[PDB]
From a paper:
Besides 10–23 DNAzyme, 8–17 DNAzyme can also efficiently catalyze the cleavage reaction of RNA substrate, forming the 5′-product with a 2′,3′-cyclic phosphate at the 3′-end and the 3′-product with a hydroxyl group at the 5′-end; similar structural features are also observed on the cleavage products of the naturally occurred hammerhead, hairpin, and hepatitis delta virus (HDV) ribozymes. Interestingly, the same catalytic motif of 8–17 DNAzyme has been independently isolated under different selection conditions and using different cation cofactors, indicating that this small DNAzyme is efficient and its catalytic core motif is ubiquitous in the sequence space. The central catalytic core of 8–17 DNAzyme is flankedbytwo substrate-recognizing arms, which bind to the RNA substrate via the canonical Watson–Crick base pairing. The Dz36/substrate complexes assemble into a “V” shape with two arms (P1 and P2) orientated ~70° with respect to each other in all the three structures. Unexpectedly, the catalytic core forms a compact small DNA pseudoknot consisting of two short duplexes (P3 and P4) perpendicular to each other.
Residue numbers in the entry:
A (entry chain A): -2 to 174
B (entry chain B): 0 to 174
Write the structure that this text describes.
DNA sequence: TGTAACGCACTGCCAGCGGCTCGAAATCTCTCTCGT
DNA sequence: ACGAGAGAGATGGGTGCGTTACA
């Protein structure tokens, strides 16, 4: 399944999910705040046609990771799980008698700029940036910036601040290539 | 069982020199200056329900041995529960069963510990809720702000309370 | 460029010392009740 | 307000490869 989408339909879906996300933690069903849900992937890059829908869920405490995605719940929508772990969670939802693919990702609070930057993409862009930092003996991934296997502590909070710090010119998501 | 404050102080006075614990073969005595009486007794309450003492343990490694291997000279006591921090005993005093609670704290936790175990509950609740509104957390181990232990330049319970921004009151006047 | 989830082979190491299984033994989290 | 002890409940080899998949 997982047919194509229009950017408009994708944006419709994101807004539909903004309030209908929760997860089974012990006894309770804990709501996921809209302020901890970020739309990434092709949708954030304002692409005309989407192949899937990508959301990034900001998990506050590190211990919560093993429960959030494995026990993810959406109010009033039929979704089948293809695969699922603590970091990735590919679902198969039904939207107005259409089968679309939904991807869920997780990131802690301190890794959020690296995550947004990673999951915004596209791949070709990331390859450009990462190979550049690789040549200066660094490694960049969705968790943080590393140098000689050491996490480099950057005094940043936003994706924009991260990009400035890596020595690159900020480009809007739709213009990154 | 029940007690009077005078009976309670007498029992405390008896134990100040008769406290020890089995540490890997060696029986180490507990110093009287490291033994603090807390609870309803320190608040000079008329009638007691139990006796509460606080044992000041010097090294962090020692905590796991003191209470679980507690020793009192020449008295028959059955243990209800016990850990490294809590130790509810049931002693025999003149063929009578009274309840004894033992608590432990390290040297740097001593003012925070005394303050916690002095109580009463209602008093602790006012103080803690007040500091919580200012983005702090206070417990029997220390003062915290944003999950970071706030180092206070204090040494005594009074010094702690003044530093926390509260008017000092003797234990029987705390509510 | 960099990482995830997953089924699997090959052990390695124990509950089982032979079997790769079900679930033992021991260790975790959660919860309930307690303390001031 | 905040934390400890005990007993209930749940886990269920460790590694590392190859494949498929995510940006
Ligand atoms: Pb085995």
């Amino acid at each position: 399944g997982g047919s194509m989408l229009t950017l408009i339909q994708g944006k419709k879906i994101v807004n539909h999910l903004r309030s209908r996300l929760a997860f089974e933690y012990n006894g309770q069903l804990i709501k996921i705040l809209s302020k901890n849900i970020v739309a990434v992937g092709s949708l954030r890059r304002e692409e005309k046609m989407l192949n899937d829908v990508d959301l990034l869920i900001i998990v506050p405490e590190k211990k919560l990771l093993k429960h959030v995605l494995p026990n993810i719940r959406i109010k009033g929508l039929s979704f089948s799980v293809k695969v699922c772990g603590e970091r990735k969670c590919v679902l198969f939802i039904e939207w107005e008698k259409k089968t679309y693919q939904l991807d869920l990702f997780t990131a802690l609070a301190e890794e959020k700029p690296y995550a947004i930057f990673h999951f915004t993409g596209p791949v070709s862009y990331l390859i450009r940036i990462r190979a550049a930092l690789k040549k200066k003996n660094y490694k960049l991934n969705q968790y943080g910036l590393f140098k000689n296997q050491t996490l480099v502590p950057l005094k940043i909070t936003t994706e924009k601040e991260l990009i400035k710090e890596l020595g690159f010119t900020y480009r809007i998501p739709k213009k990154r290539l």
